[PDB]
Structure formats: C-alpha cells, structure tokens
Amino acid sequence: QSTLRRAITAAYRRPETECLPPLVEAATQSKEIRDAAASTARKLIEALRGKGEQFVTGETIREALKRSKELEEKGFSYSYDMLGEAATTAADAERYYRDYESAIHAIGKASAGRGIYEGPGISIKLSALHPRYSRAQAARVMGELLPRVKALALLAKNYDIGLNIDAEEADRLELSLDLLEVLCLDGDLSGWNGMGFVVQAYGKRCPFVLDFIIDLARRSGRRIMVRLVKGAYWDAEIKRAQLDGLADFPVFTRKIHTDVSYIACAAKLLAATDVVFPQFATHNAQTLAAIYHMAGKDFHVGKYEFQCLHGMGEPLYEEVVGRGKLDRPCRIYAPVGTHETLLAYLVRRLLENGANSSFVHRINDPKVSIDELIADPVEVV
C-alpha cells in the first residue's frame, strides 16, 4: 500500500483515451532528435531491406553455451531461457525448477566473473514454478513461489549473473511485482545488481509500474535491470477481455498507442539510468533509432542495452553492435529446450511475425514504403 502502488491499481483499466495524453507529451521528441532518429532508422531499414528451428538456440544449456561464442565476440550477450511455462502439476513445476537451477550453475560457470552486463544471464517465468500460478489466490501463490525464486536469485548472486523475471499475462503483473519488491528488500541478496524485471508497454499500467520500480531501485540500493517490451500476449488479453464483457481492457487496442507508450516509457527509463539498467527489447528499427538518439552521446557498458529474440533480431542488430556501426550492445534472448517445450513460445512468435501490423512483417511488405516505416508514432497518432 503506497501512492506509487495506487497509481498502478488505478490505471489497470483506465479508458484508453485518458491514458494517452501523458504518454504523447512524454514521447514527444525535439525536432533535432526526431530528424536524427529518422536518418538512423532510414539507414537501418535500407540495410535490412538488403537482407521452429530458427527460434531455439540449443536443446541443452551446454549446447547453447557452446554456440554463443561467435556472436559474443562480435558484441552480443545472451539471456538464456529454459523453455517451459504454465506448470499444471507439482512434478512439472519441480522439473522446471531443476532446469533453471542447473542452467544457473552452467551459465554462472561460463560467465567466469564477467559480471551482469558483459556476461550471460538467465530469464525465468514464474508460471513454470508454481502448478496453479494463474488459478490460485495471488497471496498463497507468491508465498509458495518466494522460496524458490529466492533460492535461484541467491545462486545468481553467487556467480554474479543476471536473473530476469519474464512478464506474462496482465492479471499476474501485481503478483510478480510484489515478489520483485520482497527480493529487492532481502538482505541476503545485497550487493548483487542482477535482478531483472520485464514491463510491457502495451499495458495501461506500464509507466506507473516503471515509477514504482525506479523508486524501489533508488530506495533499496538495487540497480534493477528493467526490460522494456511491448508485449507478447495481446491476442489472448483481447480475447479474455472480450469474454469477460469488460468495457475497458488492461491493454491498448491500437498498435500506435503501444508504440507511443513504449517511447514515453523509454524516456522515463533513460532519465533513471543512475538507479536502473534499462534493456530496450525491440526488433523495430524506428523504435531503436528513437531510443538511440534519446539516450544522448554519453554511453558506457552498463548504462543501457538493447535486446532481441534469437532468430529474429540478428539482421537488425548486426547493424547496431560493434565499433563500425552504432557501438551499442544487444542481449539475445536464447530459448533452450526440446521442440515440445518450444510450442507455446512458438505460437506467440507466429502471432508476432504474422501480424500485418508487426514491424518484422512490414519490412518484407512491398506495399509498405520506407517513409511509412520511419514514421514517428506521436506525429502519426
């Protein structure tokens, strides 16, 4: 219970028309920045337009770790995800826990003291770790989940690697956020800045979650890693919201509004790089160019990074990483597992890649001009 937590609850289903004015103002860039971003985005898109096995990095963490050397030398880093989610039995949640535990040991040993920015890390889904994650009361779920996540966080602290909590459906944002707060106030994890958390910009609550996390970082002394994404579950959220007869949804219903929300939330994160580590996860060259110029000329490893999904982001970020390009780092999200554990992730990649509104679809669409692809969302909204 706090003023910052109340802003989150109040925004849950705020009407879309009332959410946007503060985002538009925050996402408005100076003419100089807009012109520079348009130039960079054009260069990236011209390069791209000259360019489920593809989505999985390896079957095992040993296999995926071996395959990461080539791109790590080019300026990429990795976040490994042992595939698995939505556990329905205690046995499944225990197996996912042991998968994550063994991955941390292997990743942490491979990190070899490179630390949380230059070395690899791990991503986890809370729904893999509790057999009734979405069907039981949030209070009891968090309490049974807490010792498992704390144990994993303690292992990540032992090796000094990143451990990110992925974001899933909207009705579990609050639970996962409460877990993040308990961990960041837990003295057994002091001195480790590897805890990471995803916030989804297609959510109406996003900037208020970001206010809460930035303040939590500042008062806890933890430099929380914050992965800003647009979001992967849009079709399911819409279908659930429609089934519930809800007049106002927890997510935006126009893609341009999510784009404006992302840029507005990026501005908020870039103003807080003292206390959080922003991670800008996107495959959209206009979004990337905007953030690249919003961040200014000062850069050091550990200030911020970009991120991308394995099999989707490499052609864009080959134009970004390295000293002959933009000299900014990118962390590749690397799924690890069998084809069967991959299926649910694959479905969301199909919804992402196949949507006519998606950047990665439009980049191949002969009816979509480069002019349209470099359009600034605020000037279009």
Ligand X SMILES: Cc1cc2nc3c(=O)[nH]c(=O)nc-3n(C[C@H](O)[C@H](O)[C@H](O)COP(=O)(O)OP(=O)(O)OC[C@H]3O[C@@H](n4cnc5c(N)ncnc54)[C@H](O)[C@@H]3O)c2cc1C
Q: How far is CA 89 from the centre of its chain?
A: 27
Task: Tell how strand 330-336 and strand 195-200 pair up.
Answer: unpaired
Closer of 123 and 193 to ligand X (Cβ)? 123
Rounded distance, CA 23 to CA 113, Å? 40
- By beta-carbon proximity to ligand X, the closer residue of 106 and 363 is 363
356 is in an annotated binding site: no
Q: Which two tokens stand for residue 85?
A: 């989610």
Q: Torsions phi, psi of 111, nearest 5?
A: -60, -40
Binding pattern for the stretch 304-323 against its own copies, x by CB under 8 A and - elsewhere:
--------------------
Q: Quick one: which of 29, 77, 200, 341 contacts ligand X (CB under 6 A)?
A: 200
| Residue 253 touching ligand X (CB under 6 A) | yes
- Residue in 126, 287, 290, 376 binding ligand X, rule: CB under 6 A: 287
345: contact with ligand SJU by CB under 6 A: yes
Contacted by 247, from ligand SJU, its own copies, ligand X, none: CB < 5 to 8 Å by type: none
> For residues 346-365, which are near its own copies according to CB under 8 A?
346-347, 350-351, 354-356, 361
Choice between 146 and 351, CB closer to its own copies: 351
d(CA 283, CA 307): 8
Task: Determine phi and psi for 194, rounding to 5 degrees.
Answer: -85, -10
Smallest distance, ligand X to C-beta of residue 14, A: 15
> Contact with ligand SJU (CB under 6 A): which of 262, 277, 333, 359?
333
Q: What is the DSSP letter of 172?
A: G
Out of 97, 133, 202, 317, the only residue in the binding site for ligand X (CB under 6 A) is 202
Using rule CB under 6 A, residue 114 touches ligand SJU: no
> Which of residues 73, 340, 371, 379 is near its own copies by CB under 8 A?
340
- List, in order, residues 6 or more apart from 327 with CB less than 8 Å away: 299, 321
359 is in an annotated binding site: yes
Q: How far apart are CA 238 and CA 254, in angstroms?
A: 11
Residue by residue, DSSP assigns 62-110 as HHHHHTTHHHHTTTEEEEEEE------SHHHHHHHHHHHHHHHHHHHHH
Q: Do residues 127 and 87 lie in contact, with contact meaning Cβ atoms separated by under 8 Å? A: yes
Q: Tell me the one-letter amino acid at 298.
A: D
State both tokens at 153. 């966080």
Question: How many residues of this chain bind ligand X (CB under 6 A)?
Answer: 31
CB atoms within 10 A of CB 76: 24
Find the binder of its own copies among 21, 112, 243, 298 (CB under 8 A).
243
In contact, 189 and 183? CB cutoff 8 Å: yes
**What residue 67 binds from its own copies, ligand SJU, ligand X, none (CB within 5 to 8 A, per partner kind)?**
none
Which does residue 133 touch among ligand X, its own copies, ligand SJU, none (CB within 5 to 8 A, set by kind)? none
CB burial of 243-261 (b: ≥16 within 10 Å; e: otherwise) equals: eeeeeebbbbeebebbbbb
Rounded distance between C-alpha atoms, residue 305 and residue 58, angstroms: 24
Q: How far is the CB of 358 from ligand X (least distance, A)?
A: 4
Query: Site residues (CB under 8 A) for its own copies?
Result: 52, 88, 135, 235, 242-243, 338-340, 342-343, 346-347, 350-351, 354-356, 361
Which residues contact ligand SJU (rule: CB under 6 A)? Answer: 123, 166, 232, 309, 333, 345, 348
Residues making up the binding site for FAD: 167, 200, 227, 230-232, 234, 253, 255, 282-284, 349, 352, 357, 359
